[PDB]
Design a protein around this motif. Sequence first.
Motif, PDB file in Angstrom:
ATOM      1  N   UNK A 110      18.290   7.027   2.106  1.00 19.74           N
ATOM      2  CA  UNK A 110      19.262   6.602   1.107  1.00 19.74           C
ATOM      3  C   UNK A 110      19.001   7.155  -0.282  1.00 19.74           C
ATOM      4  N   UNK A 111      17.945   7.950  -0.418  1.00 17.70           N
ATOM      5  CA  UNK A 111      17.594   8.539  -1.699  1.00 17.70           C
ATOM      6  C   UNK A 111      18.354   9.849  -1.784  1.00 17.70           C
ATOM      7  N   UNK A 112      18.739  10.247  -2.992  1.00 19.66           N
ATOM      8  CA  UNK A 112      19.477  11.497  -3.158  1.00 19.66           C
ATOM      9  C   UNK A 112      18.532  12.680  -3.038  1.00 19.66           C
ATOM     10  N   UNK A 113      19.066  13.795  -2.556  1.00 18.57           N
ATOM     11  CA  UNK A 113      18.279  15.008  -2.388  1.00 18.57           C
ATOM     12  C   UNK A 113      17.638  15.416  -3.714  1.00 18.57           C
ATOM     13  N   UNK A 114      18.421  15.328  -4.790  1.00 18.03           N
ATOM     14  CA  UNK A 114      17.961  15.706  -6.126  1.00 18.03           C
ATOM     15  C   UNK A 114      16.793  14.861  -6.597  1.00 18.03           C
ATOM     16  N   UNK A 115      16.838  13.578  -6.261  1.00 17.42           N
ATOM     17  CA  UNK A 115      15.784  12.668  -6.655  1.00 17.42           C
ATOM     18  C   UNK A 115      14.526  12.830  -5.802  1.00 17.42           C
ATOM     19  N   UNK A 116      14.694  13.082  -4.505  1.00 18.95           N
ATOM     20  CA  UNK A 116      13.535  13.252  -3.623  1.00 18.95           C
ATOM     21  C   UNK A 116      12.783  14.511  -4.035  1.00 18.95           C
ATOM     22  N   UNK A 117      13.498  15.446  -4.654  1.00 17.86           N
ATOM     23  CA  UNK A 117      12.878  16.695  -5.075  1.00 17.86           C
ATOM     24  C   UNK A 117      12.529  16.769  -6.553  1.00 17.86           C
TER      25      UNK A 117
ATOM     26  N   UNK B 265       0.826  -1.212   0.000  1.00 15.80           N
ATOM     27  CA  UNK B 265       0.000   0.000   0.000  1.00 15.80           C
ATOM     28  C   UNK B 265       0.854   1.253   0.000  1.00 15.80           C
ATOM     29  N   UNK B 266       0.392   2.293  -0.682  1.00 19.16           N
ATOM     30  CA  UNK B 266       1.110   3.564  -0.698  1.00 19.16           C
ATOM     31  C   UNK B 266       0.083   4.683  -0.620  1.00 19.16           C
ATOM     32  N   UNK B 267       0.550   5.869  -0.250  1.00 19.36           N
ATOM     33  CA  UNK B 267      -0.281   7.062  -0.187  1.00 19.36           C
ATOM     34  C   UNK B 267       0.547   8.141  -0.868  1.00 19.36           C
ATOM     35  N   UNK B 268      -0.092   9.249  -1.241  1.00 20.40           N
ATOM     36  CA  UNK B 268       0.631  10.363  -1.877  1.00 20.40           C
ATOM     37  C   UNK B 268       1.594  10.966  -0.862  1.00 20.40           C
ATOM     38  N   UNK B 269       2.849  11.124  -1.263  1.00 24.89           N
ATOM     39  CA  UNK B 269       3.872  11.668  -0.371  1.00 24.89           C
ATOM     40  C   UNK B 269       3.439  13.014   0.219  1.00 24.89           C
ATOM     41  N   UNK B 270       3.696  13.223   1.503  1.00 19.41           N
ATOM     42  CA  UNK B 270       3.308  14.479   2.150  1.00 19.41           C
ATOM     43  C   UNK B 270       4.045  15.666   1.520  1.00 19.41           C
ATOM     44  N   UNK B 271       5.360  15.537   1.385  1.00 19.37           N
ATOM     45  CA  UNK B 271       6.185  16.569   0.759  1.00 19.37           C
ATOM     46  C   UNK B 271       7.565  15.986   0.464  1.00 19.37           C
ATOM     47  N   UNK B 272       8.432  16.782  -0.147  1.00 19.69           N
ATOM     48  CA  UNK B 272       9.765  16.303  -0.485  1.00 19.69           C
ATOM     49  C   UNK B 272      10.497  15.674   0.699  1.00 19.69           C
ATOM     50  N   UNK B 273      10.410  16.305   1.865  1.00 23.47           N
ATOM     51  CA  UNK B 273      11.118  15.810   3.041  1.00 23.47           C
ATOM     52  C   UNK B 273      10.470  14.753   3.926  1.00 23.47           C
ATOM     53  N   UNK B 274       9.250  14.326   3.616  1.00 23.67           N
ATOM     54  CA  UNK B 274       8.640  13.313   4.466  1.00 23.67           C
ATOM     55  C   UNK B 274       9.566  12.106   4.506  1.00 23.67           C
TER      56      UNK B 274
ATOM     57  N   UNK C 221       5.656  15.814  -7.273  1.00 20.15           N
ATOM     58  CA  UNK C 221       6.970  15.233  -7.133  1.00 20.15           C
ATOM     59  C   UNK C 221       6.921  13.992  -8.032  1.00 20.15           C
ATOM     60  N   UNK C 222       7.974  13.769  -8.817  1.00 23.17           N
ATOM     61  CA  UNK C 222       8.037  12.618  -9.723  1.00 23.17           C
ATOM     62  C   UNK C 222       7.830  11.295  -8.969  1.00 23.17           C
ATOM     63  N   UNK C 223       8.601  11.112  -7.901  1.00 22.63           N
ATOM     64  CA  UNK C 223       8.504   9.914  -7.073  1.00 22.63           C
ATOM     65  C   UNK C 223       7.641  10.243  -5.855  1.00 22.63           C
ATOM     66  N   UNK C 224       6.356   9.902  -5.930  1.00 14.64           N
ATOM     67  CA  UNK C 224       5.449  10.204  -4.830  1.00 14.64           C
ATOM     68  C   UNK C 224       4.643   9.050  -4.213  1.00 14.64           C
ATOM     69  N   UNK C 225       4.967   7.796  -4.531  1.00 13.25           N
ATOM     70  CA  UNK C 225       4.220   6.665  -3.967  1.00 13.25           C
ATOM     71  C   UNK C 225       4.846   6.263  -2.633  1.00 13.25           C
ATOM     72  N   UNK C 226       4.426   6.938  -1.573  1.00 11.88           N
ATOM     73  CA  UNK C 226       4.980   6.685  -0.249  1.00 11.88           C
ATOM     74  C   UNK C 226       4.593   5.336   0.342  1.00 11.88           C
ATOM     75  N   UNK C 227       5.616   4.612   0.782  1.00  9.85           N
ATOM     76  CA  UNK C 227       5.492   3.309   1.406  1.00  9.85           C
ATOM     77  C   UNK C 227       4.863   3.415   2.802  1.00  9.85           C
ATOM     78  N   UNK C 228       3.737   2.748   3.046  1.00 11.36           N
ATOM     79  CA  UNK C 228       3.136   2.805   4.393  1.00 11.36           C
ATOM     80  C   UNK C 228       3.259   1.468   5.155  1.00 11.36           C
TER      81      UNK C 228
END
Length: 473
Positions: free
Chosen positions: A301-308, A271-280, A318-325
């Motif tokens: 372990x993700x790069x700052x550039x990629x998280x943003x 299951x995933x939810x939409x990421x809260x923000x870049x820094x969640x 955000x390109x990568x926004x499927x947050x792991x719950x």
Amino acid sequence: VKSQQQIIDSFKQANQDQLFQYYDSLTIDQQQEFIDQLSTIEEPAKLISTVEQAIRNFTQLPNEQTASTLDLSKDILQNWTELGLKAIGNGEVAVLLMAGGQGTRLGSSAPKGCFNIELPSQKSLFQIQAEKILKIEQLAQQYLKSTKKPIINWYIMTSGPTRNATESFFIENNYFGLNSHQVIFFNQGTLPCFNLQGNKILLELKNSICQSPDGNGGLYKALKDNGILDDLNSKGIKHIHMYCVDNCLVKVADPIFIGFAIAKKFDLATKVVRKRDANESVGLIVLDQDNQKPCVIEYSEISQELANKKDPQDSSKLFLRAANIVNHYYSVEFLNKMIPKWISSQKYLPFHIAKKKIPSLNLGEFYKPTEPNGIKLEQFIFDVFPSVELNKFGCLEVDRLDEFSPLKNADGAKNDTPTTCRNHYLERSSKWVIQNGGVIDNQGLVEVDSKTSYGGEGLEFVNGKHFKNGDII
Ligand SMILES: CC(=O)N[C@H]1[C@@H](OP(=O)(O)OP(=O)(O)OC[C@H]2O[C@@H](n3ccc(=O)[nH]c3=O)[C@H](O)[C@@H]2O)O[C@H](CO)[C@@H](O)[C@@H]1O
Ligand SMILES: [Mg+2]
């Protein structure tokens, strides 16, 4: 069993001479206990080598492996609900709770599940989840028109440190209404703590090494060693729902999630939810373009550039926004086939390094450090994802306000505190009530008792009725 001398030789040949600095000055019982502790560490030289080893092209999952409860029609969701209630009613569903973490960020002596977010009911996370379980068992029984209520085995993985207080808590509370036989405790293993360079194991005391739970990824080996996988087979369990203890909104044994896996014949789903923000601080579920496999990239372990990275098709996202719950589905058949592979190789369960401030022996007595002074090792539960076949992997996006509110930090922080957990929990309760014609006074929030509603259903009787702040429905 190896003799005291053999264990010592092996650790010396692995260059852990610092471990015996004070050996000769210890009493015989201290030496024997130290050796006993050391003997639980299988192949030290390897482990120290493996730790040495420990010290990218992603894209969004293909549409074929994703689905979202925020988009599907009421009939499809209802159909999955029924597929899951049937599996549950047939005794085919079991639940795995990961409760081996220390929850350091929460600053509490007791195991996190015992935590009370001060809902009007004052119920702990453990109790909330147990009523969640009793409730779905009843819903399954109503659905099947059974005479007897189905049983959902709740396997709770504890760590050496959380075990006694956890089992005692459950006993003291008569298992919160569940059958004592359906709550099954088992301990995960540990791993030695190392110095910052990762070549020397740390001494906690003159006669004891520092050790910590091997991460939620150590669940697979705990499953096999504690005869849990064996139990799954003996009870004819086919479906497993694994989740994190800190989610106060968690739909334990969610029939929709299970129906989803059944409907699609998935070996593994998440299951995933939409990421809260870049820094969640959440891992992100993506597709590794290199091997065309699903996987999760952890927040640490993700790069700052990629998280943003902004999404090419939409600048506001955000390109990568499927947050792991941490809500996973596993078919028991998949676990029977894969667990032996996963625990005999670092390929699927690599060590993850975390610098820590570790109270331990100073290089000459104990001491609480004020800057990182060592590393703890962790295996991550999701590292086995890329071993699944893509068309056998499912990713269900769910609604955060109804399904995910973690207890990560002590009160005071901006997010994931007892306060946010409480508010999210009460907001969800209040929304269900109101959504059913109930009327809550202004500035008022109510709590829905799981005994009354698993997740919003059966609240019609609330129509027209009024409520005051803090009522329990
Ligand atoms: C490895 C992992 O799962 N990372 C996830 C975890 O992050 P996060 O780093 O916050 O993980 P936690 O440390 O809180 O652990 C996750 C769950 O695993 C359990 N646990 C942990 C360590 C251990 O040795 N034994 C054990 O049983 C904890 O009790 C908890 O139920 O939750 C986030 C959601 O909030 C996700 O977005 C992260 O991808
Ligand atoms: Mg899709």
